[PDB]
Design an enzyme around this catalytic site. Structure first.
Site, PDB file in Angstrom:
ATOM      1  N   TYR A 198       1.522   5.727  -0.313  1.00 45.16           N
ATOM      2  CA  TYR A 198       0.954   7.045  -0.136  1.00 45.16           C
ATOM      3  C   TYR A 198       1.932   8.157  -0.482  1.00 45.16           C
ATOM      4  CZ  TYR A 198      -2.433   5.110   3.321  1.00 45.16           C
ATOM      5  OH  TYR A 198      -3.435   4.435   3.957  1.00 45.16           O
ATOM      6  N   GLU A 201       0.848  -1.176   0.000  1.00 46.85           N
ATOM      7  CA  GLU A 201       0.000   0.000   0.000  1.00 46.85           C
ATOM      8  C   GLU A 201       0.896   1.243   0.000  1.00 46.85           C
ATOM      9  OE1 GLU A 201      -2.046   0.930   3.720  1.00 46.85           O
ATOM     10  OE2 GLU A 201      -3.945   1.078   2.625  1.00 46.85           O
TER      11      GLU A 201
END
Length: 185
Positions: free
Chosen positions: A80, A78
């Site tokens: 970001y 994940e």
């Protein structure tokens, strides 16, 4: 570029009014939520993509992130690129910094334990982060040159998976309330 992906996930907590607007525009009104992620972008992410966005409204009343958000598989990761936040600035294990698109970002890694993943169900996975040292002003045309981040992460042993999943400019919230209006291209 035309966005072709609409992300609208919530864990069921509180109120999340996500509006799929015209083109790359979307808005969100949330109240007393659990965790949620809403945004527009592309079905297949790319390490060479240049993301443009304009947050006409960024008004979190608590924990919320205005961030590029995406996933890769093999391995499951994940990631970001956080340009702004609410009351809490996200951090983790410090790796270094990267200058890109006029700002300076701290590079962090964190591990999520028994957390919901893109595939559904729960599992343990790593998250890569680029977090601006100070909040980026909103209401202007902003650019995120993703390749600068991918290259910086690589230099710290932070390699992404080989199977690219979605990639969106999102609004993520955690047990908070607020409002956002963003246009992506």
């Amino acid at each position: 570029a035309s966005t072709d992906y609409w992300q609208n996930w919530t864990d069921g907590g509180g109120i999340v009014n996500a509006v799929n607007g015209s083109g790359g525009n979307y808005s969100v009104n949330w109240s007393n939520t659990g965790n949620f992620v809403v945004g527009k972008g592309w079905t297949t992410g790319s390490p060479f993509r240049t993301i443009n966005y304009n947050a006409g409204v960024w008004a979190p009343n608590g924990n919320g992130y205005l961030t590029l958000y995406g996933w890769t598989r093999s391995p499951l990761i994940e990631y970001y690129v956080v340009d702004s936040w609410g009351t809490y600035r996200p951090t983790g294990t410090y790796k270094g910094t990267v200058k890109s698109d006029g700002g300076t970002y701290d590079i962090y890694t964190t591990t999520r334990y028994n957390a919901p993943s893109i595939d559904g169900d729960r599992t343990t996975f790593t998250a890569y982060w680029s977090v601006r040292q100070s909040k980026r002003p909103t209401g202007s045309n902003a650019t995120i040159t993703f390749t600068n981040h991918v290259n910086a992460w690589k230099s710290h042993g932070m390699n992404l998976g080989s199977n690219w999943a979605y990639q969106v400019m999102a609004t993520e919230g955690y047990q908070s309330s607020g409002s956002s209006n963003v246009t992506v291209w």
